Amino acid sequence: MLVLVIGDFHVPHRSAAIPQVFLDRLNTGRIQTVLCTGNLCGKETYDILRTLAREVHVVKGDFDEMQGLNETEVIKIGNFKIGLMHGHQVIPWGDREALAIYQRQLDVDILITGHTHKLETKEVGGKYFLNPGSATGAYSPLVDNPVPSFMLLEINDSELTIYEYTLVDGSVKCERVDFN
Numbered sequence: 001m002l003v004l005v006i007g008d009f010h011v012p013h014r015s016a017a018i019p020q021v022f023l024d025r026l027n028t029g030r031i032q033t034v035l036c037t038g039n040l041c042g043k044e045t046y047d048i049l050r051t052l053a054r055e056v057h058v059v060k061g062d063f064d065e066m067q068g069l070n071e072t073e074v075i076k077i078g079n080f081k082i083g084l085m086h087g088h089q090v091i092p093w094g095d096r097e098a099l100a101i102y103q104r105q106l107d108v109d110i111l112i113t114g115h116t117h118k119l120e121t122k123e124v125g126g127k128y129f130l131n132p133g134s135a136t137g138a139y140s141p142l143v144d145n146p147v148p149s150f151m152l153l154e155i156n157d158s159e160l161t162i163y164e165y166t167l168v169d170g171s172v173k174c175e176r177v178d179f180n
């Protein structure tokens with residue numbers, strides 16, 4: 001059960017494009033579902049991930065402009081419950097305790113966050129925190145030299161493996177972690 005985690009590739013009124021290294025590798029990857037943190041470029045992007053997975057899971061962020069969306073959602077893949085949201089509501093942004101209380105509040109095992117534009121996967125009390133980072137290296141007050149990034153995760157029941165993909169200076173890097 002291998003799912004794509006990505007998002008956060010736009011900000012209000014700023015230029016960005018879509019790498020086809022991620023697409024060309026992910027187009028054939030045989031991904032059943034997709035987990036998105038949000039801030040889509042628009043209707044031109046939210047279908048690209050329908051070429052990737054038949055089921056796409058989207059939520060709202062600071063500069064989302066579509067309709068028919070929820071700002072939070074919870075998912076059960078394998079034996080893993082995971083909570084999806086953008087994190088633009090979490091104040092302060094990226095604070096270690098706020099994510100924790102949100103994670104006891106949502107009764108998830110894993111909480112995806114966005115809006116920091118970094119990859120940052122930190123595990124605590126058996127709880128996993130995954131941030132896709134800026135999928136196209138979008139500009140944020142947090143980062144001015146950002147890298148495009150995303151994360152794939154295969155959940156075989158209780159065993160979960162993560163793949164940290166970063167397009168660093170023309171080189172594609174994968175940093176894989178094995179969890180059980």
Ligand SMILES: [Zn+2]
Pocket residue numbers: 008009010039114115116117138140
């Ligand atoms: Zn963002």
Ligand SMILES: [Zn+2]
Pocket residue numbers: 008010039061062063088114115
């Ligand atoms: Zn954002």
